[PDB]
Subunit: 416 residues, 3 copies
């Protein structure tokens, strides 16, 4: 038992040791800023490794999942997945707005058009490391390219390419085999990185509990943390199991239990795209879900799901707006929540989406950007919980989509 | 009939409706600059889609066309194509100079060396989205990289790679199959984009006839438009059919008629590289031209042909020079015409080459860049006609090259 | 005989003619700076061609060499190669320090951490043309990306990818075949460039002996050149042959003689990565070295070897430090030598590594950067000798590693 799953127990022990080391160093030592930065180097190296493997994995896996489906049945499955994700996103948005209004812890047109612009990039190679942005200037619109991987356009192109090569028949079989092999190789490289994972995680946690200086941020942010945690808990325990039970007449909690390893891996590494191998294995072997449904549904959810964004980034934006004593109407609150939810779409995949996404959402909404440092402190913990919620939602969606496509999966088998 | 070719009639109807809508909005409405920009968003989205597909299509198609030819016969075919293109370019240059001198509508060394520098880029990945440029500075030469796809170096590398892998025999067959499948997939994605084409075209035309403000630009630019249109018409109707009849003893106008769909598609979408599927189909099925000659000749012409550049951009440069009352000798006029013709080489492929190429040519020649906005107004129409002329020239060249290589195409068949 | 090896004799004649032309032009002509720059254009074009082919060649060849080895024997061979390179680098460092101290011709933490940071880039596409760098700022650390290919991370990823796909069995065979064909194609393109090589070399040499103005740099740099040349000569003639004779009980000088063509090609083109085809051919056919050992050892040495860096760049750094009359302890001299040796790792592959590496090492050490122009003058000659020394060291290492892995190469054959 210990040898079979030594990675998970070693990671848990590393987390505990990192928390203890961070507390002890903070209490019994006086480190300068430079030494505090040098103390977290292994965690930065681990994050660089994790970011290095996101692109090829997502691209190859998405293409493989699209091409594995028959041409005449892929539309209905995609429609079901889209409907499920839309319903979950809407419910999450409503819950987040209601909670942020009740607890009170405290141009959007260009930002909405930039999403469509980034859906269709002007260069395929440039989209791998750069993104497009526009702003008003004296009024005319001026656009430019800045650093940051454009995963939305890559996803769209991957979907189109997979659909095209899955219909060519024998003319596209070489591409199908090439991308299948590439996906397998990337999955093995991810497994290789998972061996170095725990040592980086230890220093990441130790250095996270070190940068806190005054500790009064915990006093000021108590209600904001309570709001985000309550929203995530309600979404995880009430809404998703009920939807699964409504569609699938089976015990939702047994299904959630069967994905415990994937959930804990997502909670530890704080990334959904890099948890894909564990998610695949748990869904296929523990829950007896069809491979064809899983390999197509999970890659889309690992990059598109926005149930946690609407419950974290939108709540943070509303909290920041409330901090400045700004008077907000019921229409304005909805505007901010939708803008924040839509602005960040690849947050689940990023190992620390919050650090880069907070300033992007604040700039898109048009609020003072100097208040980001107040909320960055608890991002390392709220973001990891959000990652667990997103992975659980993706697994539930995979199960639901498998349940609904019963005749399609039996017609797809008689053909072969 | 209507169902078979619904795309072309729908595109024509969209063009008519866009012209009517633009005229009506300009006459009966007062729109601000921001609203005028927001009115043309679908056209911008269509242009982004068109630009997204240029790179893979050109690269894969060019490699496939080079590799499909036998190693011992590819030299003569390439030589014939080069000679044809050189002759047509020289005739176009002479005609443009003569017309611009007669009607009078009104350092180059670094620019010429930059063409050779861009023929051999220092990085293959960087060449996909960046270009090299040099300038004098106090005198020493300083070079840097700026945005803009370097299609010249990509073409050169594609030619070399295709020639190399077409001679390896069975060792390069996997690469040949891979690039064949990639070319087919890109062609299907282009066909997919052609469905959204008409809706974007409507708003593009409607927003083009909207940005005109004073309407006195039509009074000032009457002679410049007349000169460009007369040059293009003379090249299309007199010179190219005569050359085709001289080499090929067949009716030139029947050959031109058989490519009407491709000509209209080029006139509508204002891009030659994206018209490649229609050109291939019309040349192979309507004119009974050999596939091996077509798949090699057309990709080169869609990126290298300069008969329309010498008749449009050179005429515009000479017009700008005449506007400033600059005294130009017969040597100077030739210098400007050759510099403008050589500076722009990938204009035919770009959906709106004129917008970006005008400032590049003006900077290369060394003339005031503030006069570009005067001529940008009628670019959307002169450029579309230029695109029709270029496509017709490419088709005529394909026919001529097929005619000349008669023994090579019969020796290439006895081998297989 | 003349027809078989016309390239080498033509290159030697071009070198002689270039030296004569440069001397004659310098003595009997007065050229301005702009004309001196325009005189060396063919050499710049040749260097652009050479830089264009480095990336695909190195990546494909390294992957192919890793994947060709059996999974159970690749570790010992890699360990032997690493030990050999470490021993040679240490001996070179010691010799360089001793010589620079005896003859006297006259923060590092961030630079050392940047090496590990660049070992694991955050983006695979961006690593092809950009590098990461950090600096202190008021103290916090700020990082950014600048131009320059990150070959270290590409090498690491190539090693991991080759190891992963060589164990997949039949699931990764398509990738193995693809990269084998790509390596062959790149090797043929290199052979094509070798035809234009001599004409560019002539003008490169002619323009190198032209930029010298005062000729007093030869008087001031006499001892620095003597030190570097003596170190390189001692390393080439004494240490490496002795190590080869100790491990391999065969005549070291016959082995060196059998690689004369590769040595002369490295001396002429001043690049190790582009000399790889000649090195492969000479090692496999003239010295009867196993192909499996050669195709794996040589690509690693052509990018990682640091015996010449420690003998050239470290000596130059110590000379610059001595020029400023800076008092340096025995610990400081070691610090500078190790920092300079470790900072430059891909110098052997670059056609003119010295030009870009001198300022990088000077910035990393923290010394006045205005003294680089004094030592740039003789870089074109010291660098070419360094390239010969590095190629000889790589060949000797290939021989030694082949000798040590005797049972592994006989067990790897009984399996097939
Ligand atoms: Hg934290
Ligand atoms: Hg227009
Ligand atoms: Hg020199
Ligand atoms: K995340
Ligand atoms: K065009
Ligand atoms: K070198």
């Amino acid at each position: 038992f210990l040898k079979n799953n030594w990675v998970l127990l070693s990671t848990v022990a590393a987390v505990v040791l990192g928390i203890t080391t961070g507390v002890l160093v903070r209490e019994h030592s006086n480190l300068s800023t430079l030494e505090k930065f040098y103390f977290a180097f292994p965690g930065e190296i681990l994050m660089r490794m994790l970011k290095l493997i996101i692109l090829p994995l997502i691209i190859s896996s998405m293409i493989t999942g699209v091409a594995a489906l028959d041409s005449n049945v892929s539309g209905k499955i995609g429609l079901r997945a889209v409907v499920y994700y839309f319903a979950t996103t809407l419910i999450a948005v409503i819950l987040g707005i209601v909670l942020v209004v009740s607890i009170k812890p405290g141009s959007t047109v260009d930002a909405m058009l930039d999403l469509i612009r980034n859906m269709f990039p002007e260069n395929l190679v440039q989209a791998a490391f750069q993104q497009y942005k526009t702003k008003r200037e004296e009024y005319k619109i001026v656009g430019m390219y800045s650093d940051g991987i454009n995963v939305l356009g890559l996803i769209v192109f991957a979907l189109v390419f997979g659909l095209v090569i899955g219909k060519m028949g024998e003319k596209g079989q070489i591409l199908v085999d090439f991308f299948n092999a590439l996906s397998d190789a990337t999955m093995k490289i991810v497994q290789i990185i998972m061996w170095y994972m725990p040592l980086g995680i230890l220093f990441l946690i130790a250095g996270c509990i070190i940068e806190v200086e005054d500790w009064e941020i915990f006093r000021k942010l108590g209600l904001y943390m309570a709001t985000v945690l309550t929203g995530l808990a309600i979404h995880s325990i009430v809404i998703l199991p009920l939807i699964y039970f409504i569609v699938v007449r089976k015990n939702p909690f047994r299904f959630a239990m069967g994905m415990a390893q994937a959930l804990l891996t997502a909670l530890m590494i704080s990334s959904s795209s890099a948890t894909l191998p564990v998610t695949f294995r748990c869904a296929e072997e523990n829950n007896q879900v069809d491979k064809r449904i899983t390999r197509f549904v999970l890659p889309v959810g690992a990059t598109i799901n926005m149930d946690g964004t609407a419950l974290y980034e939108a709540v943070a934006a509303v909290f920041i707006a409330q901090l400045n004593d700004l008077d907000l109407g019921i229409g304005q609150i909805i505007t901010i929540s939708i803008t924040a939810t839509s602005a960040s779409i690849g947050a689940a995949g990023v190992p620390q989406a919050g650090l880069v996404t907070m300033v992007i959402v604040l700039s898109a909404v048009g609020l003072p950007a100097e208040d980001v440092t107040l909320i960055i402190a608890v991002d390392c913990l709220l973001d990891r919980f959000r990652t667990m919620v997103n992975v659980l939602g993706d697994a539930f969606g995979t199960g639901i989509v498998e349940k609904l496509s019963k005749k399609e999966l039996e017609q797809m088998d008689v053909s072969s």
